[PDB]
Design a protein around this ligand. Structure first.
Ligand SMILES: CCCCCCCCO[C@@H]1O[C@H](CO)[C@@H](O)[C@H](O)[C@H]1O
Ligand SMILES: CCCCCCCCO[C@@H]1O[C@H](CO)[C@@H](O)[C@H](O)[C@H]1O
Ligand SMILES: CCCCCCCCO[C@@H]1O[C@H](CO)[C@@H](O)[C@H](O)[C@H]1O
Ligand SMILES: CCCCCCCCO[C@@H]1O[C@H](CO)[C@@H](O)[C@H](O)[C@H]1O
Ligand SMILES: CCCCCCCCO[C@@H]1O[C@H](CO)[C@@H](O)[C@H](O)[C@H]1O
Ligand SMILES: CCCCCCCCO[C@@H]1O[C@H](CO)[C@@H](O)[C@H](O)[C@H]1O
Ligand SMILES: CCCCCCCCO[C@@H]1O[C@H](CO)[C@@H](O)[C@H](O)[C@H]1O
Ligand SMILES: CCCCCCCCO[C@@H]1O[C@H](CO)[C@@H](O)[C@H](O)[C@H]1O
Ligand SMILES: CCCCCCCCO[C@@H]1O[C@H](CO)[C@@H](O)[C@H](O)[C@H]1O
Ligand SMILES: CCCCCCCCO[C@@H]1O[C@H](CO)[C@@H](O)[C@H](O)[C@H]1O
Ligand SMILES: CCCCCCCCO[C@@H]1O[C@H](CO)[C@@H](O)[C@H](O)[C@H]1O
Ligand SMILES: CCCCCCCCO[C@@H]1O[C@H](CO)[C@@H](O)[C@H](O)[C@H]1O
Lengths: 231, 231, 231, 231
């Protein structure tokens, strides 16, 4: 099974993630009177990964996330060499979603990706609820780590075969349930990028945080499972 | 196992889809103060398919959708010959639901299938939130394609056996979470028809869109898996 | 494995159903500002059965419902002789829940099981949203039938082993999503009884409907699978 | 597989439970206009356990709860000797979450763990909706018992392998759906402690209830399965 497809799967996967989990935020979360709120976005998030982990996890591993791929290298599950391909696939996928989405969102008067934020991840004054950078750090580091704690745990050799996608996608929804008000929900650098580019302002100015923190978090989780819990 | 049953399963299946996913919209989505909103409709949608994919997927394949059957032909999974039977079963099932439903909905004064829309799919002025035909196209084409990307992926030879219905039904709920405000949620020509007939106005005038777009989308997904990702 | 336990399982199971799915309605559905609405009740409903189907389905079959047991006899899955034991277990279980619940509900001033309805199932003037008896009939008959269509389908010899409880519990939540505004959600005579006794008024006066309709519905579903779809 | 890890798994597990299920309450449940309400907290709760039962249940058994560990001893599933280690791991894990959380929550002006309650469990005047201590007892005893009824049932020798985490985590969400308005939702002494320490007032004054009741409940469930239903 040639590597062009893994990339293709990681690519489509991450697009699907950014199309659904950001679409929901942008189009449905706030819709007058019948909108899906944070709950529904958190759910949507999980489901993109549930669904695509099932659809192509059996191909690429089903990461859809730079922090996952990296954090998976840290846990000794993924090879050094293949990491850079995934992270690019992942990022490029996300961008294409952010555009098609951006274009879609544009068909309804009122739309302003700048003003509105375009589901871009922020901290401090750009925390959906005004949380400090410190809160943002703790929440993203704790939740990134746990995410990969859950990924490694669920894909453990001894862990019941197949359920992994439920275990993970749901994790993400849980993470969403928790973290939307602090970071607008991230733990996925490809995702913060995809829409940061289109918000094109502060979202681009803080974007680094949402590479650095979740990646380190992903390493911290990978090492917490690999050393402490595994073997 | 004779073909009359596959049709019977596809028939009951699609009815169950249109009864639940449209019922929820019509009866519960907007109910004063405790109603289930778009979230709950999106969920209901997914669940009809989750439940009936489990209940009879083991018989017909469990399509419940003309775009699925067609898009499945495109991925080389379904036979040319059997496609027309499914699409009819699918459509006829849906209609019977739309009526029983229509009759049910009628037992509560106020009811006006014309005025209200009867959960019919629309774009532009009939987009639940006023989206352009272009937005409607992009959203339906992207989401139809992905749907079959997920169906083919989940039913892949190498993909863990049995989980498919969770993988798909949830996908649909996700699609619902995303697309209710743009198209009132479709990717299923049988479904747009079932209630278009009873709305009997603009819903019938735009119905074509919701055959053409999701079908092409289903082909595009079928070909994206079959050529790029499968083998 | 002696029969006293099947009854014990069906008994605890149905209690758990009536404790959770009616508790949610009575205590949480309407709670000021953060309450769980119909959505959350519908979910709770499904989950009682998901959870207890897993917990003891492997013992009794996991019916928790007179209409299920009967409708299962109709599909040729359950033995004639054992049906009466289940239905009693089922009913007695539910009552004990309705009381403990009733007692629990009583600890908060304001409480009036008469005034409020106590989650009792009704039609017409006692339809949560004023639906006609006809609408109530169609909705309960369609949804009872489908429920057992899904139960028989999911527990089919050829259907993937184990997933059944997800398939069913979710069905029920879906049914809840649909039918709360028409019947306050039933398809379970034991359940309508359990709280009808405590509402002690119109709920007792209409209770028959919620034996007759869902039972016939359960037969209609049992026969629809057994004759048409099975073999 | 050395015991330091079981403890480590139970430790991380319970932290993840208290981070997610209490985070959601504290940060998202009430968020203006798009917050996740009781529904979303109930969900979050379930999901922590779903996810971590999958991630490390295959290591420690995956209790994350003193009442579970104890109640599991009562059902003859867990060894006498190992119980005290789990309960400590469990408690220590939770505390670390409550702090990191507490610190996180602090980054948003307004925050007052005293005033607000900090998701601490209470009864009577500290019942989120003013329920009597009696209601609180019945609800916690019924729901603790059932929880372990479901745990023992789901992990039964004859019960389908692997699904257990869905069966349990969902149970908990169901319990949340039901019991948030009566106790602010507990059945987990480690959890009531974790945030009682930080609320540092009445939450510490009633904390005992949320050790005594759910533990006894867990025994009552363990014995109800072991004697009546198992064998
Ligand atoms: C190719 C994927 C990574 C792109 C990241 C965008 C670069 C971040 O840098 C940003 O560049 C913008 C100019 O384009 C400016 O508007 C921002 O102020 C600047 O900070
Ligand atoms: C594979 C391409 C993605 C790499 C990650 C890009 C991280 C962007 O980092 C951004 O750089 C801006 C330019 O100065 C700074 O102004 C911002 O503070 C920072 O958010
Ligand atoms: C994936 C991108 C990683 C970025 C390099 C890590 C170094 C962190 O450097 C950070 O860069 C910010 C923006 O340039 C500055 O404003 C911060 O003050 C600084 O801490
Ligand atoms: C048999 C299933 C397909 C039926 C599609 C309905 C035909 C669409 O065409 C419609 O016919 C109606 C008259 O019945 C008119 O009200 C509409 O304006 C017209 O566009
Ligand atoms: C198997 C039967 C279903 C076939 C698909 C029917 C597509 C209906 O197409 C409809 O036709 C109307 C009649 O002119 C047009 O006015 C509408 O623009 C169009 O929505
Ligand atoms: C399943 C039904 C497919 C319809 C045939 C595809 C041709 C698309 O033709 C469309 O038909 C519409 C309604 O008649 C016209 O109003 C549009 O302008 C036209 O683009
Ligand atoms: C034992 C389980 C079935 C009990 C059903 C209750 C009987 C229904 O009958 C009811 O009896 C009540 C007197 O108790 C009256 O209040 C009602 O008006 C009457 O209709
Ligand atoms: C195993 C015991 C449960 C049997 C089902 C009880 C059905 C109750 O039936 C009730 O009877 C009342 C008494 O006249 C009538 O007034 C009500 O119309 C009717 O709802
Ligand atoms: C499980 C209980 C089944 C009841 C017997 C079925 C006969 C239906 O009989 C019904 O009884 C009602 C109440 O007594 C009457 O008010 C109705 O008019 C009548 O149709
Ligand atoms: C080590 C884990 C268990 C700690 C439980 C806290 C002790 C409960 O006791 C509490 O102690 C506090 C002083 O610290 C006081 O504020 C409370 O009024 C008192 O009741
Ligand atoms: C392993 C450590 C956890 C043990 C459980 C601690 C139970 C705390 O119990 C608390 O004690 C307080 C001190 O008097 C009392 O005032 C409170 O009424 C009571 O809630
Ligand atoms: C895990 C902690 C268990 C506590 C010991 C069980 C004895 C119950 O004792 C209780 O203690 C309360 C607080 O001290 C008193 O206020 C109550 O009146 C008393 O019933």
């Amino acid at each position: 099974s040639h590597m062009f497809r893994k990339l293709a799967a990681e690519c489509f996967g991450t697009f699907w993630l950014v199309f659904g989990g950001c679409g929901s935020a942008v189009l449905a979360a706030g819709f007058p009177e019948l909108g899906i709120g944070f709950a529904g976005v958190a759910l949507a998030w999980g489901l993109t990964v549930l669904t695509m982990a099932f659809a192509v996890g059996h191909i690429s591993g089903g990461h859809f996330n730079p922090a996952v791929t990296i954090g998976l290298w840290a846990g000794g599950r993924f090879p050094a060499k293949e990491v850079v391909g995934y992270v690019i696939a992942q990022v490029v996928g996300g961008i294409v979603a952010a555009a098609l989405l951006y274009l879609i969102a544009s068909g309804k008067t009122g739309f302003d990706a700048a003003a509105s934020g375009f589901a871009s991840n922020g901290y401090g004054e750009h925390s959906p609820g005004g949380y400090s950078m410190l809160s943002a750090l703790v929440v993203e580091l704790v939740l990134s780590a746990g995410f990969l704690l859950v990924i490694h745990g669920a894909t453990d050799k001894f862990a019941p075969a197949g359920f992994a996608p439920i275990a993970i996608g749901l994790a993400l929804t849980l993470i969403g349930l928790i973290s939307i008000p602090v970071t607008n929900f991230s733990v996925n650098p490809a995702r913060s990028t995809a829409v940061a580019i289109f918000q094109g302002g502060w979202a681009l100015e803080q974007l680094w945080f949402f590479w650095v923190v979740p990646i380190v978090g992903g390493i911290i989780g990978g090492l917490i499972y690999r050393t402490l819990l595994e073997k």
